[PDB]
Amino acid sequence: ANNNPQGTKPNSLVCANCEGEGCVACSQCKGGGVNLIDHFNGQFKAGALCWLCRGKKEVLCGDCNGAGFIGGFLSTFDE
Amino acid sequence: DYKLTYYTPDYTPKDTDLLAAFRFSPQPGVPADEAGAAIAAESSTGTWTTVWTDLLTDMDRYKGKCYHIEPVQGEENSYFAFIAYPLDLFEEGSVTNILTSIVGNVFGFKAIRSLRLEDIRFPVALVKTFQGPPHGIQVERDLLNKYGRPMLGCTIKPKLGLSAKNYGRAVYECLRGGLDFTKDDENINSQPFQRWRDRFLFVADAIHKSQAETGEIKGHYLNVTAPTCEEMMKRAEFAKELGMPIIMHDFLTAGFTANTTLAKWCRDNGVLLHIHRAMHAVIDRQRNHGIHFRVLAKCLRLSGGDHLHSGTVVGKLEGDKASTLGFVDLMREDHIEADRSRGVFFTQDWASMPGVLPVASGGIHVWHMPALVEIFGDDSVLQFGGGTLGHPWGNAPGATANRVALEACVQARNEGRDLYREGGDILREAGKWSPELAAALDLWKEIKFEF
Amino acid sequence: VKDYKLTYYTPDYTPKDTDLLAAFRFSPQPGVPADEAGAAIAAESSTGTWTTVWTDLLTDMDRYKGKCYHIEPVQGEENSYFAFIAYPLDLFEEGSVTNILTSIVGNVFGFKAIRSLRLEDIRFPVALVKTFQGPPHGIQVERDLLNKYGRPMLGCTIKPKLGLSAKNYGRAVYECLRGGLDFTKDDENINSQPFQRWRDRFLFVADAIHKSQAETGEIKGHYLNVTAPTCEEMMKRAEFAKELGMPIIMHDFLTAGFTANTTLAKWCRDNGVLLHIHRAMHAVIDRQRNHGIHFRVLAKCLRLSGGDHLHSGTVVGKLEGDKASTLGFVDLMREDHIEADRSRGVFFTQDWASMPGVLPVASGGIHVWHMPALVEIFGDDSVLQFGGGTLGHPWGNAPGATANRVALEACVQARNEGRDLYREGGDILREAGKWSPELAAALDLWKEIKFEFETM
Amino acid sequence: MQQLYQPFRPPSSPIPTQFRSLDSAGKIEILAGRMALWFEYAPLISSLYTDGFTPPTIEELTGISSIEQNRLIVGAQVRDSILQSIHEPELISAFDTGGAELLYEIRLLSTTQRVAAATFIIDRNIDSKGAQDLARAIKDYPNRRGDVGWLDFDYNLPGDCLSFLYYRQSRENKNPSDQRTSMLLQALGVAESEKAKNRLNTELYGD
């Protein structure tokens, strides 16, 4: 996925990564919904649900934590 | 996020919404609309999205909505922002909850240089759940039986290093002369050189003597600010047992919980409460960061209090004088229309809640008597510092000087004369039948100017 | 030449949103017009004066004055009118129902110019509903305390009222509770009387509750009647019922009063007990269609004062107007915003401002064959009280309880699955009375009633 | 551990085809691991109920509170009542992830009047409040047998029922008063029949 550590739009406050959505697409199944490769040893085998998103094709975003912007008690450190 | 969902510029606010007006200055690069939406989101659920709120379709019932971001003229890189909060976010009877919910963590936002809270509007639905002033204005003017003129008070300046015996003698001298109230210094509670029970005893003795001797009703503000709540209640109960009619408190160092507790006690036990405003310049002195004082005056009128310090306006330039007149009108009156020229941002209706009495102080003398008498009117108290204890003859002569000057000015205002132009003339034709007023007019040479 | 506007009947006057509105239905004696009858009703409920003689002495006696702002005739009846009156917000004490009552209905009902007077509705502003406490818990909180989701609650009242010992009363309570019911109810007339004092009844009922709840695996409750001659005695009963660990108590708000009911509601709020409000001595007021106080007003005053459950009476059907009125004042105490609907009985648009709801309780002479209709009228936020429908089963109390439980579960399941309950009800119950003999006996005892409601 | 005297329990409950040969621990470990979607393992809790597993015990083992359990069972039942009749797959493929809290409100309508309600509620993205008020307005329609302009609003579709509710609520007023205008404009914004529309325009405008 993107490699912005924690970045906004050029002038706006909207976080660039999620574009203000607050949610991104799963990076394991690529929005597919089912697992593709066996991952650990065989307890997560291909054909079943995705091991990460549990079958929702949509996860939260790290830089902007569910807040459509950068700053505040969710995305930044409290002083 | 081209849609902001928090900046609804066409939203009109209800009559059960709490409105707030901020003046903010955004960082370089950030626009104004998004800064307003961010101020609305920080002081509520701190999200623009709906990834948590959409738990079971329980959305947007507990979020604020910016609806006006007009800019302020003169200054640039500085704007006004209006915000509307629902009513079911706040609890009843608690001012701490309102403060915590609004100004809790918005001031620590990172994408703004500075942020100030200028006004606030409480709906009637929320005004009716607080007690308010214990007594008010009409009741506290009927209890003391003093009609048709301001009240007179004196502060005792030789604060520290005075035995309780001498303290009582000075109080007796001042009160016997003709004053109404004496005031206890702000930082005299229980120091080792003068404990509080002794002070209370001798002050009560002096009050009883002077009141039984002069026929009027006298009083002394007794400072009950304590380290805990048990000590505060002990001091208040003892001051009531002696028969004292009025006490004192500090609502900004002791807090709002202690002030609400004391106000409820004072309502139940028939005592008047005078509120001193120490430690207030720490919050509101700079015009670019803090909490304007009219917001704290409103919060005080809500929680409790009968008198309130407000500061003189005899030498302010303009705007500041208009601002102080505005937030004096916000305290004494019952319905105030929006007039941005004198501070008031929103229309406030108090639903027949009693008023609060302004107090002027800070080194004023007899020559200021006309101006004050026509600015604050007759619903106020006038505190004198050196203007009473500095008379060449003593304390009782200074008391009589101030009393004579005040009654002369008010009698001259009643007849229809003008106090701006010919106030000094009135004082001069009054300072002929009395030596004390003549000595006072000769000591304070300040006849500065009028009109 | 003409009376100066009567100063009280101001037709073109819309009332502000901080005024208390009241709707009277009155009928005046022959030879009196309606306009000044309405103006006199407005002057009696306040300063009893049309003139201005007792004022003008530096006084504004026009801020404490009602104003009849609307008069209309009742369609379908001659010589009877509706008068609307608006009072300010300064006449009323903050947080007192006694004061509202004694200020509105104090003197006016004895006025000699009218032949009859009835108070049909009343509207409180938000500024006034915010100064009261309301129900101690509400609906969601009391559904979470008992942990009963997705069905009406079941309760039984004990018919062999008197002459029964406390130990025997406890045994019957136990038998009913372990059969499958949720609540049992103390008889209203039962206080500390020579044959059964209160502390003994409390002891044995608490023991039965603990036994049955521990052996069946869910939460059971009994409403203990804590009505006393004095407030101090009432507090002793309530405190001892809390010490035993009881979840719910009972009161009686029309013979004890509103002061005692407000005090008990505050106690229950501070100590986490639910409160059930019995409805006794009410037909003395709200029965005759032309005098008294409609029960809708008292339901509103109760939601203000305090109480979690309120009796409403089964309305399975008598006539569509009366059942419409009952549905009106059943939705006036569960919802949060009710729009004016003159057919349902509501006159003003009432807004409650996030005050909790109140569970309506259907009671009195209902049995198994009535279960479908009820389940679709009152819904899922309600209680169903059974009298002889539980203790009269051919072979005991526990099988009667089980029959009622099975019928209720079957009906709500068949409603969730999609079928309707106005045409498939009897068939639902006969299908459920095959894998269960108790329900079969109960169906054989009571005669099936044929509903003929709006089927088209 | 059996809990004494629960004689009101049904005989049993049906289980989907894929789980017809599992034990109780299999149901437990498939509920705890979410190894299905809600409408697959709702019959599993509905069946576990009938073996002496009280909602508190299942909440202790699996980890879903009783309110969620009841909501899921009722939602799966409503969905199964929808799919087995005249329908179109725009919604069954949309009720796959998170549609129970909305399916819990149309449970008051009979199977005849559920597909139209589902279409109306998913076409405009309405939450639980709007769904509850819509179902109540639909159920209140046959009671008003005779009123002002009742037969001009059809009842075989939810838009006209809700529009009639708004329209009859607006008539409790007089000349526009600036409050009737809002209610009428909100009524015309949901109606979907041309006869109701031309009546609403006949009364709001021109006449």
What is the SS3 string spanning C97-142? HHHHHHHHCCCHHHCCCEEEEEEEEEECCHHHHCCCCCCCCCCHHH
Residue B152 in 3-state DSSP? Answer: strand
Q: Rounded CA gap, B293 and B285, in Å?
A: 9
D70 vs D66: CA distance, rounded Å: 6
Residue B125 DSSP class: H
Say how many domains are in chain B. 2
The conformation of residue A34, written as its DSSP 8-state character, comes to: B
**Closest CB to C339 among D6, D56, D169:** D169
Q: What whole-number distance in Å separates Cα of residue A45 and Cα of residue A36?
A: 8
Same domain, C78 and C208: no
3-state secondary structure A5-28: CCCECCCCCEECCCCCCCEECCCC
Best of B126, B128, B147, B349 to mutate (most C CBs within 10 Å, chain C): B128
The pairing of beta strand A59-60 with beta strand A23-24? antiparallel
Are D163 and D196 within 8 A, CB to CB? yes
Q: What is the DSSP string of C300-366?
A: HHHHHH--SEEE----S-S-HHHHHHHHHHHHTTT-SEE--BTTTTB-S-EE-SS----EEEE-SS-
* Among the listed residues D71, D122, D72, the one whose alpha carbon sits nearest the alpha carbon of residue D93: D122
CB A14 within 8 A of CB B34: yes
Yes or no: say if C408 and C154 are a contact pair by the CB < 8 Å rule.
yes
* DSSP state letters, B292-305: -HHHHHHHHHHH--
CA dist B201 to B16, B227, B243, C279, D67, Å?
Answer: 49, 21, 11, 59, 65
Using a CB-CB cut-off of 8 Å, the residues of chain C touching B88 are 353-354
Among chain D residues, the shortest Cα distance to A58 is held by D97
Distances (CA, A) of B436 to A34, B400, B423, B448: 99, 7, 18, 21
Same domain, C206 and C300: yes
Q: Is B189 helix (H, G, I), strand (E, B) or coil?
A: coil
Rounded CA separation A57/C456 (Å): 49
Q: Which residue of A lies nearest to B33 if distances are taken between CA atoms?
A: A12
Are B93 and B166 in the same domain? no
Q: Cα–Cα distance between C279 and C235 in angstroms, integer?
A: 21
B-chain residue closest to A22, CA distance: B49
Query: Is position C282 annotated in a ligand binding site?
Result: no
Contact C314, C362 (CB under 8 A): yes
Q: Which residue of D has its CA nearest to B60?
A: D127
DSSP helix, strand, coil percent of chain A (3-state; round to 5):
0, 15, 85
Closest CA to B113 of B30, B26, B33, B36: B26
Return the CATH number at B376. Answer: 3.20.20.110
| DSSP labels, B248-272 | EEETTTS-HHHHHHHHHHHHHHT-E
Q: What is the dihedral of CA A57, A60, A63, A67, to 10 degrees?
A: 130
Cα–Cα distance for residue pair B396/B401, rounded to 1 Å:
9
Cα separation, B292 vs B286, in Å, equals 9
The backbone torsions φ and ψ at residue C452, rounded to the nearest 5 degrees and listed phi first, read: -135, 50
Burial class (CB in 10 A: 0-12, 13-18, 19+), C123: buried
Cα separation of D4 and D9, whole Å?
Answer: 12
Residues of A in contact with D34 (CB under 8 A): 54
Angle, helix B256-269 to helix B229-242, in steps of 10 degrees: 30
Looking at B220, B274, B276, B391, which residue is catalytic? B276
Out of D66, D142, D169, the one facing C456 most closely (by C-beta) is D142
C-beta separation of C154 from C181 below 8 A: yes
Answer whether C411 touches D (CB < 8 Å).
no
**Domain shared by B420 and B451, yes or no:** yes
CB C150 within 8 A of CB C375: no
Supply φ then ψ for residue A69, to 5 degrees: -150, 180
Q: How far apart are CA B289 and CA B114, in angstroms?
A: 6
Q: What angle do CA C221, C223, C225 make, to 5 degrees?
A: 155
On whether any CB of chain D is under 8 Å from the CB of B282, the answer is no
Q: How far apart are CA D31 and CA D105, in angstroms?
A: 25
- C-beta of residue C209 within 8 angstroms of C-beta of residue C220: yes
Same domain, C123 and C137: no
Q: In a 10 Å sphere around its CB, with 0-12 CB exposed, 13-18 middle and 19+ buried, how is residue B42 labelled?
A: buried
Q: How far apart are the C-alpha atoms of C192 and C178, rounded to whole Å?
A: 26
Residues B58, D102: contact at Cβ < 8 Å?
A: no
* Among candidate residues C304, C262, C130, the one with its CA nearest the CA of residue B91: C130
Residue C125's domain is classified under what CATH number?
3.30.70.150
> Residues 89 to 108 of D: which have CB under 8 A from any A CB?
97
Structure-determination approach: cryo-EM
What would the two tokens of residue D53 be? Answer: 């597993």
Q: Do B429 and B417 meet the contact criterion of CB atoms below 8 Å apart? A: no
Q: Identify the closest residue of chain D to B56 by CA–CA distance.
A: D101
Active-site residue flag, B276 = yes
The angle at the Cα of C102, spanning C98 to C107, to the nearest 5 degrees, equals 165
Nearest to B122 by CA among B359, B336, B357: B336
Among all chains, which residue has been given the structure tokens 């406490």? Answer: C133
d(C-alpha B214, C-alpha A32), whole Å: 94
Is C372 within 8 Å of C411 (Cβ atoms)?
yes
- Spatial distance between the Cα atoms of D137 and D163, rounded to a whole number of angstroms: 9
Buried b (16+ CB within 10 A) or exposed e, B287-303: eeebbbbbbbbbbbbbb
Q: C–A contact (≥3 CB pairs within 8 Å)?
A: no
CB neighbourhood size of D121 (10 A): 22
Q: Which long-range contacts (CB under 8 A, 24 or more apart) does C441-448 make?
A: C441/C393, C441/C394, C441/C395, C441/C399, C441/C403, C442/C367, C442/C368, C442/C393, C442/C400, C442/C403, C442/C404, C442/C407, C443/C368, C443/C369, C445/C392, C445/C393, C445/C394, C446/C367, C446/C368, C446/C369, C446/C389, C447/C369, C448/C369
What is the distance between the alpha carbons of residues B260 and D157, in angstroms, rounded to a whole number?
57
- Pair of tokens at residue D11: 């005989």
Chain D interface includes A30 (CB < 8 A): no
Question: How big is the CA angle at B48 (ends B43 and B53), to the nearest 5 degrees?
Answer: 90
Q: Tell me how crowded residue D62 is: count the other CB atoms within 10 A of its CB.
A: 21
Asked if B34 and A12 come within 8 Å (Cβ–Cβ), the reply is yes
- Helix H, strand E, coil C: the string for chain D is CCCCCCCCCCCCCCCCHHHCCCCHHHHHHHHHCCCCCHHHHHHHHHHHHHHCCCHHHHHHHCCCCHHHHHHHHHHHHHHHHHHCCCCCCCCCCCCCCCCHHHHCCHHHCCHHHCHHHHHHHHHCCCCHHHHHHHHHHHHCCCCCCCCCCCCCCCCCCHHHHHHHHHHHHHCCCCCCCCCHHHHHHHHHCCCCCHHHHHHHHHHHCCC
* Owning domain of residue B65: 3-130
Pick from B75, B80, B65, B62: nearest CA to B22? B80
Question: What residue in A sits closest to B31 (Cα-Cα)?
Answer: A12
Alpha-carbon distances, residue B44 vs B8, B19, B49, B106 (angstroms): 16, 14, 13, 9
Mutation site for C-interface testing, chosen from D1, D3, D5, D80 by largest number of C Cβ within 10 Å: D5
Domain housing A57: 11-72
What letter would DSSP give residue B27? P
Which residues share a beta bridge with C70?
C84
Give kind and range of the element (H or E) at residue C297. Answer: helix C295-305
Residue B65 CA to residue B71 CA, distance in Å, equals 18
User: Which residue type occupies C388?
Assistant: G
Per the CB < 8 A criterion, the answer to whether C304 and C132 are in contact is: yes
Question: Min CA distance, C348 vs chain D (Å)?
Answer: 10
C257 and C379 in a single domain? The answer is yes
What is the token pair recorded at C229?
Answer: 């001659």
Do B138 and B247 have their domain in common? yes
Cβ-contact B339, B376 below 8 angstroms: no
Element (H, E) at B274: strand B272-276
Q: Are B209 and B185 in contact (CB under 8 A)?
A: no
Those residues with Cβ within 8 angstroms of residue B366's Cβ, 6 or more apart along the chain or in another chain:
B387, B401, B402, B405, B427, B437, B440, B441, B444
- CA C171 to chain centroid: 30
Cβ proximity of C70 and C42 under 8 Å: no
Write out the DSSP string of B353-396: ----EEEE-SS--GGGHHHHHHHTTTS-EEEESHHHHT-SS-SH
CA distances from C62 to B50, C54, C87, C288, C323 (A): 52, 12, 11, 35, 42
Token representation of residue D205? 């405008």
Q: Are C384 and C366 spatial neighbours (Cβ–Cβ below 8 Å)?
A: yes
List the Cα angle C256/C262/C267 in 5-degree steps. Answer: 110
CA gap B39, B154 in Å, rounded? 45
Query: C-alpha angle with apex C14: C8 to C16, nearest 5 degrees?
Result: 100
The binding site of A consists of: 15, 18, 21, 23, 26, 29, 50, 53, 58, 61, 64
Which of C159, C167, C266, C318 does the annotation list as catalytic?
C159
Instruction: Provide the token pair at D85.
Output: 């009749």
Using alpha carbons, list the distances in angstroms from residue C347 to C96, C305, C332: 23, 21, 11
Q: Which residues of B are annotated as a binding site?
A: 105, 155, 159, 183, 185-186, 277, 309, 361
Q: Alpha-carbon dihedral of residues B136, B139, B143, B148, nearest 10 degrees? A: 90
Contact residues, C window 327-366, toward D, CB-based 8 Å cutoff: 339-343
The phi-psi region of residue D89 (left if phi > 0; otherwise alpha if psi is between -120 and 50; otherwise beta) is alpha
Do C165 and C47 share a structural domain?
no
Separation CA C24–CA C68 (nearest Å):
10
Q: What is the resolution of this structure in A?
A: 3.0
Torsion of CA B366, B370, B372, B374, to 10 degrees: 160
Residues B261 and B398 in one domain: yes
Other C-beta atoms lying within 10 Å of the C-beta of residue D124:
10
Q: SS3 for C298?
A: helix
Chain B residues touching residue A22 (CB < 8 angstroms): 47-51
Q: Which of B14, B57, B58, B60 to mutate to test the interface with D (most CBs of D within 10 A)?
A: B57
CA–CA separation, B208 and B198 (whole Å):
16
Is residue D185 within 8 angstroms of chain A, CB to CB? no
The CA-based angle C406-C408-C411, given to 5 degrees, is 105
Taking an 8 Å Cβ-Cβ cutoff, which residues of chain A contact chain B?
11-14, 19-23, 60, 66-74, 76, 78-79
Other CB atoms within a 10 A radius of the CB of residue C300 amount to: 21
Question: Which DSSP state fits B70?
Answer: P
Domain boundary (B130, B161, B179) is at: B130
A79 lies in a domain?
no
* Pair type for strands B181-183 and B219-223: parallel
Residue A5 lies in a domain: no
Task: Identify the residue whose tokens are 């509706």.
Answer: C82
Q: How far apart are CA B154 and CA B169, in angstroms?
A: 14
Structure tokens at C25: 């239905």
Q: CB of B56 within 8 Å of any CB in chain D? A: yes
Q: Are B16 and C354 within 8 A, CB to CB?
A: no
Q: Where are the alpha helices (DSSP H) in C130-249?
A: 140-146, 166-179, 198-216, 231-244
Give the DSSP letter of residue C147: T
- Is residue A53 assigned to a domain? yes
Q: How far is the alpha carbon of C95 from chain B, nearest alpha carbon, in Å? A: 10
Q: Return the closest-CA partner of residue B152 out of B343, B341, B405, B419.
A: B405
Q: Which of C65, C278, C294, C393 is catalytic?
A: C278
Residue with tokens 């705007």: B319
Q: What H or E segment, with its residue span, contains residue B307?
A: strand B307-309
At residue C277, φ and ψ (nearest 5 deg) are -105, 110
Closest partner residue to C127 among B88, B92, B125, by Cβ?
A: B125
C79 assigned binding-site residue = no
What count of Cα atoms within 13 Å lies in the side-chain half-sphere of residue C326?
19
B351·C131 Cβ contact <8 A: no
Specify which residues C171 forms β-bridges with: none
Spell out which residues of chain D touch residue A49, defining contact as CB-CB under 8 Å.
Answer: 35
Q: C377 vs chain B: nearest CA distance in angstroms? A: 26
3-state secondary structure of A59: strand
Do C146 and C107 have their domain in common? Answer: no
CB contact (8 A) between residue D66 and residue C147: yes
- In the residue annotation, C294 being an active-site residue is answered as no
* C341 labeled part of a ligand binding site: no
Sign of CA dihedral C439, C440, C445, C451: positive
Do B98 and B166 fall into the same domain? Answer: no
Closest CA to C173 of C188, C156, C195: C156
If asked whether residues B245 and B154 sit together in one domain, one would say yes
Other Cβ atoms within 10 Å of C341 Cβ, number: 18
Tell me whether residues C130 and B352 touch, CB distance under 8 A.
no
Given a contact cutoff of 8 angstroms between Cβ atoms, the answer to whether B361 and B276 are in contact is no
- Dihedral, A7, A9, A12, A15 alpha carbons, nearest 10: -50
Cα–Cα distance, C316 to C337 (Å, whole number) = 25
- The distance in angstroms from the start CA to the end CA of chain C is 60
Count of the separate structural domains present in chain A: 1
- Looking at C132, C150, C175, the residue that finishes a domain is C132
Measure the CA–CA gap between B398 and B154, rounded to whole angstroms: 10
Which of B107, B130, B153 marks a domain boundary?
B130
Decide: residue A23, CB within 10 A, 0-12 exposed, 13-18 middle, 19+ buried.
middle
Q: CA-CA distances (angstroms) from residue C267 to C226, C254, C261, C360? A: 13, 19, 10, 22
